[PDB]
Structure formats: structure tokens, C-alpha cells
Design a protein around this ligand. Structure first.
Ligand SMILES: Cc1c(C[C@@]2(C)C(=O)NC(=O)N[C@H]2CO)[nH]c(=O)[nH]c1=O
Ligand SMILES: Cc1c(C[C@@]2(C)C(=O)NC(=O)N[C@H]2CO)[nH]c(=O)[nH]c1=O
Ligand SMILES: Cc1c(C[C@@]2(C)C(=O)NC(=O)N[C@H]2CO)[nH]c(=O)[nH]c1=O
Ligand SMILES: Cc1c(C[C@@]2(C)C(=O)NC(=O)N[C@H]2CO)[nH]c(=O)[nH]c1=O
Lengths: 309, 310, 310, 309
């Protein structure tokens, strides 16, 4: 069978991800690499009207004291469903075509602009740090993350805050800090779990980044520490089982992924060549049937056409 | 490896004289049959404050013209995320323990109070019919329905509308409003769900029959697919956008492999208990992956009950 | 046009405490439910002399080595032509009156004692497992199964083997021999029938899975298709001849559209009566083609009963 | 949609049918006309061993007094199942591809060597006249005749008995008489039914050929008169309902067919040109889907390859 390489570029916005991906796609041939872009059309028109403007207005409202936290949470939560639709439906129809892992060329390389966890975990968690989402809602999205398909290669970004801020300024600094923290925690969470970390075993250590390198991080530097809020705990100090189960799901989903860090503090061509090198050691997978390749290509192109602008 | 029998009691609420959870308690006294009751504590306290009350209030305010359709949709979409949480979390931890089918008694019989599709498909669809949810939000929830595992036995109820209205009027839950439009909506969605599984099991191809909506198995007009002919999902030339067509493909794939059993609720609680148990004879059983899969499930069910069921 | 509900009681014989026809008589006292009983008169007199006796004698003689396998096959094939006649004739005159489906009470509920597949598929297949029929004759009968019309509801029974043996030992019919090998054979065929409908309704493609016989749905090894891997149907290179592959395509097409309901017979006649009626709630109903289709059916059933049922 | 022409050549053996059909097929192009031949391989090897030799031996046995009538009937009946298998399975898989009637060129013409009624009605009835089959068994086969697909054109043959006998002799004369009578009755039965004949209305007229031309025949000259045997009647003189229903099926199945008579008392080329002319006024049908034509061709060719020698 032919082999497939799926790469999800993710992490905080404004680091140079779209440019980098586009430069990568440009090097290859027409048919050996397809790009599933940002589904901006879905977020502005197809799924709802101006979902991103709606999200930023709500935050300002709450920040301003124009609305309550409960109201902000209802909006963010409802908006996140719209936000993650494209990522989720794409994963669901892609799923049946993915076979077992092969080994770190591929007949087809699929580069995605973000992964379902961006919408079902990362933004929700960042909004929770911003006060516009409750931890329970975050765990509700966590519980819906689809089973992690084999060969799930995720590329996160590293960019100095000053360089990031400098760049991002053509401005919610809090949201930028919250999103960077969440993605930093996410990288440690993968390492922690692949280094044999058990959140249940280390829960009590809570009180008061490298995704595939370095020593086992402390649970305090992973995503689990966001979920020790009073709302989730009982009168005895510990967390409720529903939420503890959500944490298990989180552990199961992140556990099998292969995450890589891409230094964006370089020129566009440098980033592209850094990403290229990073793809060498990524896990590829076989496809279920002979006709999977063509179908995956058509699926990606149709997504780009209909949803990416 | 031992065998497991999963039975999800579902359908429009308020059909039996006793609740699904009360019926469940009656059956969960054999040692070979454990239940996963309604997570009421989560809906009223844990996940948020009085979520069922919020839902019915919101619908009522929409109907009275006090709030906009978009305002209701935001509340209802967010409310459904909270409502399905326990089901989604239950499915995800139980999934790895479910093996392949066995054939046509089982070591353990797990009986649930609803399946993830009620909070991810059925309730949202009903709210779409009530004007309180967008069809795009409904397909977004459909896109997140967990893969259908082997041995997914779903019991839906049969009950004449007037008897349903009557029986529902006697158990008005905390914050619930007796709404005949919603009862019609929810009963229709479940009837369409039943027809859809049949349609799909009999060869039905939604893409091939789509044209029949605008001009042996049920007609596509009598399945859940008719609901998604909504104008919000169509491009200027009337074609369904591909995003939504993919959600329908997912819907088709998730439903087709489910085994639907119809329970006649027009009888007494005792009768509904016998009936249900009789129905188990034609249900599909699966094998469990590990030797210690029985106990994990039992504890899951016990812990769930203890914590979320009162 | 009024609606009709057809219910075919089938499965391995000797499961309920009362016969299928006796149960039928009990239900045929409402004016909205007519029955088509067992055509015993045809089998013992009309069509030929004591056909059931001939069958069991023949099997017994085969087992004792008094007659050849080919001699038994000739008798058994001819005997099955006679056994299914009434069912085939019933289907063909009733067919033109059956219209398309209605949806998920009916004007008339027609309850039959067996469906053409028992005499055209199930019994012959069992006899193939008993060495008294060739697999080619079984596929020849399968090739003549009338097209499956809409609303084909088939009730099959569930009953633990020892209880089945016990209950069957108390009603030994005229000329019948209590054969445990045949009971195993017939019970297996019906279990495989049930699995086959499921297999097919869930996506199953016999041609695509055929390779698995020699090296979510039931494995093809647990469906009726495994029976036809018999060496008599294969060419020198192991491929199934096309004649037979076409018979399997027909089998696939006839079964897939049937709706199977499992009835637990491990209870009393009264219980089996309630159960059956409860089961009607999830059965598929159809419309009739003409306004005078109700009466024709009633008279058919009445005339049938009167003449062939004692 | 493309149109299809199905023609079933049938009638008594030895009239010049195979030759005629072969000459017909020869005139057309490769792909516009396919021939579904006699499935001799199935009858001699695939379905059973020497089914025809077995049938002729049994008749001789009974004629000789070596076996009883009951024994002969069990054999003939069992043999007929084998005999009609190929015709029946072919009709069953062909069925889904046949659309509604069009009008008396076609994209594809299918010429069959016999129709299911040969095995499910005609031979059984002829064996009943020969005493080797019971009338009840005959009606059991009649009850299994598949629904008559639209565009069912059947061509029967006409040949003087002396010419037929002369020809057939390189010898069961009784069987030849019985088969000719049965096919003669069959032609009248179609005419009778298409002229508004009702067997139930005329049953009492019993006591003591043109298929698409002439006046309404008397029931006494149709197939219904074979079924007034004592075995089928009750003590009150009339027939039993089971059998009466079988007669209805017979009436329903034959009613919609379009039967033609082909004079075989001519030279091979004459027969071919007579058959050609006869196909001009035959009913064609549409096919359900675009790909039906190719599939029907493959089905016919595969039948010819595997079953016709
Ligand atoms: C993915 C995602 C984003 C991220 C997006 C949608 C956002 O903020 N703005 C935009 O221009 N594109 C992306 C940034 O790369 N934002 C959000 O609120 N929820 C989400 O789920
Ligand atoms: C499952 C479900 C219900 C069903 C529930 C939560 C309902 O409304 N009221 C109640 O107290 N318990 C159940 C009835 O079976 N309702 C709803 O709005 N969305 C859902 O997703
Ligand atoms: C239907 C059927 C039966 C079933 C019957 C005829 C059986 O064997 N004995 C009896 O007296 N009535 C039925 C039992 O339900 N048996 C058989 O050999 N071939 C068939 O085709
Ligand atoms: C079709 C048929 C025949 C007819 C056939 C099979 C026969 O007799 N001999 C043979 O050489 N080919 C045919 C004659 O055209 N004979 C029979 O006994 N039963 C049947 O059903």
C-alpha cells in the first residue's frame, strides 16, 4: 500500500505558520502535497456570521464589564462549536482511510492549518484563563476530542514574546499570553505522558518547553493544572469523577501524538527549511484502500476551495 | 475473554410510568446487570446551574418574542455541550474495553440511561425544529458523535401521543415546561431516527436520493436527512455545501451500524421491565479486550451512579 | 389506501409450549388480526401422502446406512418442493396487493405461520448439514425465493437448547423422529440467518469477504455464506462457480431487506402472546394497492385456514 | 436510457432452434447481440451428474415397470430443480436491470436458449402426461415461476409431426407428443388470457395453435385442462383452493408475455430470416441504470463460458 504523511501545523497565531506552510507546499510537485488551509469562509459565512468578530467582541464586553462571566461563557462555548466544525468533520471522514503506522517517500503529504485540538482544547483553555469560559465547558470540549488517528504529527511554534508581540502588532496581549501558555503547557503535556506520566499518580503535587526532548516535566507545567479549580472539586478537596474521566480522555488523546517544535524566529525561507527537516523524522501511515490517496486529495482540495476563502 | 451486552435506553423523554433511571434501578439487582443512570447532579449542579430549567425558560421566551432566535441558539448550543458531557466521557473511557462481536448469556449486561446521540443529535435536531438552534450547530454536534462500536443496542419507545402527553404531565421535572410543540418535535426526531437506521441498513444512499427532497426502504423524506435541506446549509444554486454533506456522511456511518429495538411503553412499569429484558434476546453482544474489563465497567457504572445519579 | 402489517412467525420448530398455529388462533380473535396457519392438510394429504414422516424416515435410514446420500437427497429435494408450495402460492397471490411502506395502528394485521424462506432456504440448508441434500439443490431453491416485498417482518425465536429439546420432546408430530443432530442443524441455520441479515444491513459484501473463509458486523464465518464454501460448488482452482455466486447475490438481496424480530420463547404461551404483540410496535407496515385489498386478504387467510389448517 | 431486447427461443426440442439462433447471432455485430446458450455443463456436471441421462433412465424404468409412479415422480421432481436452476438464477440477477416497456434499434439484444417456464412448467407438465410426475408437483413448480419481467418475448416453434419425427430421429415418441402438446397448449393459453379469458369463469366448460392471432380459444385447448385430475379435486367435484391459486399464478405469469410462433419447416437460412422478421414487432424495454448494458453482456458471456459447454 501507498503511504501517507499527515502534518498539522498549530500553536499560537502570528508566528509565521501560514507563510511557512505555503513555502513548504511550493517546493513539492502539484500532486504529492496538498494543503488543508484555514477555513475562514466557514467561520465568517457558512457556519455562522463573523464567528471571530463575535468572539473578540464578547471578550471586550466582559473585559469592559458590559456583560457577565456567565454570558461570556455561553457565547464562547457556542462559538467554539462553530469554530471546530471544519476540523472535526474533516477528521471524521478522513479516519476510515488511515491504516497503521509505517515508519519515520510518502505518496501524499497532507499539511493542515491546525488540528481539532486547537478548537476542542487550546482556545477553550485560553478563554478559561481569560475568564470567558468555565473549566467544566473546557472539559466538555475535551471529552469530544476524536480518537487520535495513527501518524498524528503536530508541529507547534516557538517565538520569543517580544518578537511575537512585535510581529503580531500589525491587540489583546492577555489572549496572546494565555494562548502561548496553553500551547507551552500542551507541549509539556505530551512529553509528560510519553515519559510515562500518570496524572492520577501526581495529582497531589499540584498547589501554589520541549514536546519530544528533555526530561519528564512536572505535572505543574502541564495542562492538568488548569483543572484544579474549585468548580471541579468536591467538598473533600478532590476532583469529581466526571472531570477526572475527562482528564483521562485528555491523557489518552495526547499520549499517542508525535509533537514537534518549529523555531519561527528565522526568515521565511529558514522556517520552511526548518520545517522540511522536521518532516524527515515524522511518522507516516498506510492507507486502507488503493483509492484512498485520490479521495484524500479530492477531500483536501474541496476543503480548500469551499472553506479556505 | 468474557462477553458484554450494552443496552442504551433512549427515545423521547416521559414515556414510561417510572423514569428510565427508576426502571434501571429495578433491573440492577441481579449482579449480572449494572446500570448507568441519568446524570442529574451534573446538569443541575456540577456542569452548570439548572441546565434543564434554562433550556425550557429560553424556549418559552423565544416563543413569547422576548429574545431573538440567535439569542436562543447560543444558549441552547452551549446547554447541549453540558448535557452530553457525561455521555461522551462515558463512551470514551468504555470504548477501549469493547472488543468485536460474539454472535447472535453474557457475563455482564450494562444498561444505560440514554446514548450520546440524544444530546448530540436528537435534542439539538428537535430544537432546530423549534427554531431555537441553527442547522449548522446540529451538524457540528453530529460531526462529534463518537464512532459507533460493535454491539450498540439502542432501545427507543413507542407510545400514542395522547398517552405520552398524559404520562409526561404527571412528571414535570425541575424547571421543565409542558410544551406540546417540543413533544411533537422530539417525537418526530426519534421516529425519523428509527426510519433512518432502517433506510441505511436497507441500501439507502443519501447522496443518491437527495434529489427526491425537492422533486425497499423508507422514502428519504421520512428520514433525518430531510431536516438538513434547510436553506442555511445550501449554496446559492441550492447545492448542499461539502462541509455539511460530510456531516451527513458521518451521520450515515454512525447510524447504519446501530441496532434499534422498539419498546412499547403503553403498559405498566412491570410490563416495560419484562419487555425490555425480553428484547435482550435479539441484542448483539461483544467480547471485552482484557480480563479485568468486567470490574472496570462495574466500578465505572457504580461510581457514575453514586456521583451523578443523585 | 389502508395500511397492512405482515408478520411471519418462523424459526426452528418446537420452541413455544403451544404451536405457532395455536398461538395464532389465540391472537386471531380481534377482527383486526387474521392468521394464515400451518398447511398441515396439504403436507399429509393434498400435496402428497405424509410428507413429514417421509422426511424423518429418510433421514433415519441415511443415518443407519440403509440408503445412499444421493437417494436421500432426491427424496428430500422433492419433499421440500411440496412443503413450500402453500407458502409460495400464498406469496404470489398476496404480492400485487402490497404497496410501499407507510413509516415507523394498521387497518389489518396478517400473521403467518412461517415464510417461504423456511421451505426454500432454512430446511434445505439444515438437510445439507445433515448430509441429506446437495448444496446445489439448496442454491436452486434460494434462486426461487420470491422477491422481498416492503414490510417483510420475520419473527425468529430464542430458546436455550435443553429447553428446546424438552419442549420438542412433548410434541412429537405425526411421523417425526426426535433427532438431536437435526435440531442442532436447524438451530444453527436460523442463528446464521439472523446473523446474515445483520451482516448485510451493516455493509456486508459477501464477495469482498469471501477470502476470509479460507484464510462493525458479524464475521462471514458466522453467516449463511460459510455453508456455500462446500466443495461441490467450487471449480478446480477453488473459485465458486458463477452460477452459485449469482445464487448468493440473490440470497444477499432477498435477506438484506427483511426486518428480523427475536422472540424469547423461554416463558409461557401467554407471555409469548404478549411479547409478540409488543414486538409489533417496531414492525414495518405497508399500504395496500386497491381499496378492496383488505377483504381479499381476509378471505385468502380464512379460506387458507379452513382448507389447509385442519 | 438505452433499450434492451430480450428474446427467449423455446418450444419442443429438435425443431432447429439452436441453428436458427446461431444464424441470427452471426448476422449482427460482436457487441450488439449476445447469446445465452443451453447450460449443458450445469446439467451434466455442475448441478448434478448427467441430469438428462438420469431423467431418461427413470422414464424407461417406469415404462418398463422397474419402478413405481411414486418413485419416478420423486426423481423427475428432484431433477427438474436441477434443470431449471440456470434459467432461474439468470432471471433473478437480470431482473433489477429491466425497466418499463418502450415500444416494438436496441442497444443490446439478448437471445436465450429457453425461458424459466420450460423447466418450471412445460417439461414438468409433459412428464405429468407421461405419468412420471404428479399434477400437484407440477403446480408446485408453477407456483415458483418468477414474476414476468416486462418485455418478455417468447418464440415458440411450429413443425409438422412427420417432419419433426423424421428430423428428431438422429427415441421417445410419447415424450415428443407430450412435449408438442404442452407447447401447443401453452400458445393457446397466452392467447386465451390476452383475449380476456378467465379460467375460473370457464372451469365448468371442461369435461370429456396461435399465440398472438386468431379467436379466443376454448379453455379445453389451454393448459388449465391438465389440472382437473382427481388428486386436485375435492369430494364435491371442484378443485382445492391451493391449486386454484396456483392456476391464478399461472394466469398472471403467462398473461403479460408476448409469444410468437416461428415456422421451422424451412431451410436454416429461411428460419433465420423468419426469426429476424419476427423480432421487428417484439417489445423492447429500457434498462434501470446507464451501466446495465455492459453488465448484462458480461452476465450473458459468463453464462455462455461457464455453463454452455
Ligand atoms: C482555532 C481557533 C481560533 C484561531 C483563529 C480562528 C483566530 O483567533 N483568528 C483567525 O484569524 N484565525 C485563527 C488564528 O490562527 N480562535 C478561536 O477563538 N477559537 C478557535 O477554536
Ligand atoms: C438528553 C437531553 C435531554 C433529556 C433530559 C435531560 C430532559 O430534558 N429532562 C430531564 O430532566 N432528564 C432528561 C429526560 O429524559 N434534554 C435536553 O434538553 N437535551 C438533551 O441532550
Ligand atoms: C417448513 C418446513 C418444516 C417445518 C414443519 C413442517 C415440520 O417439520 N413438522 C411439522 O409438522 N410442521 C412444521 C414445524 O413447524 N419441516 C421440513 O422438513 N421442511 C420445511 O420446509
Ligand atoms: C428444459 C428441460 C429439458 C430440455 C432438454 C434439457 C432435454 O431434454 N435434452 C437436452 O438435450 N436439452 C434440452 C432439449 O432442448 N428436458 C427436461 O427433462 N427438463 C427441462 O426442464
Amino acid at each position: 500500500m501507498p503511504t501517507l504523511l499527515r502534518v498539522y501545523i498549530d500553536g499560537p497565531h502570528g508566528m509565521g505558520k501560514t507563510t511557512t506552510t505555503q513555502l513548504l507546499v511550493a517546493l513539492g510537485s502539484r500532486d504529492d502535497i496538498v494543503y488543508v488551509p484555514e477555513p475562514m469562509t466557514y467561520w465568517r459565512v457558512l457556519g455562522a456570521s463573523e464567528t471571530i468578530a463575535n468572539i473578540y467582541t464578547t471578550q471586550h464586553r466582559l473585559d469592559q464589564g458590559e456583560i457577565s462571566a456567565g454570558d461570556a461563557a455561553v457565547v464562547m462555548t457556542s462559538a467554539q462549536i462553530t469554530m471546530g466544525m471544519p476540523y472535526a468533520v474533516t477528521d471524521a471522514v478522513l479516519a476510515p482511510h488511515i491504516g497503521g503506522e509505517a515508519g519515520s517517500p510518502p505518496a501524499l503529504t497532507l499539511i493542515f492549518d491546525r488540528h481539532p485540538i486547537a478548537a476542542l482544547l487550546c482556545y477553550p483553555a485560553a478563554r478559561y484563563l481569560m475568564g470567558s469560559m468555565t473549566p467544566q465547558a473546557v472539559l466538555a470540549f475535551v471529552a469530544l476530542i476524536p480518537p487520535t488517528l495513527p501518524g498524528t504529527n503536530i508541529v507547534l511554534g516557538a517565538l520569543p514574546e517580544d518578537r511575537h508581540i512585535d510581529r503580531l502588532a500589525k491587540l489583546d496581549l492577555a489572549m496572546l499570553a494565555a494562548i502561548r501558555r496553553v500551547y507551552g503547557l500542551l507541549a509539556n503535556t505530551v512529553r509528560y505522558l510519553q515519559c510515562g506520566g500518570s496524572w492520577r499518580e501526581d495529582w497531589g503535587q499540584l498547589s501554589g518547553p520541549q514536546s519530544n526532548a528533555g526530561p519528564r516535566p512536572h505535572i505543574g507545567d502541564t495542562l492538568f493544572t488548569l483543572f484544579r479549580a474549585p468548580e471541579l472539586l468536591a467538598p473533600n478537596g478532590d476532583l469529581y469523577n466526571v472531570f477526572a474521566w475527562a482528564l483521562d480522555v485528555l491523557a489518552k488523546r495526547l499520549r499517542s501524538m508525535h509533537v514537534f517544535i518549529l523555531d519561527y524566529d528565522q526568515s521565511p525561507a529558514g522556517c520552511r527549511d526548518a520545517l522540511l527537516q522536521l518532516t524527515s523524522g515524522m511518522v507516516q501511515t498506510h492507507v486502507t484502500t488503493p483509492g484512498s490517496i485520490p479521495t484524500i486529495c479530492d477531500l483536501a482540495r474541496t476543503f480548500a476551495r469551499e472553506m479556505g476563502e
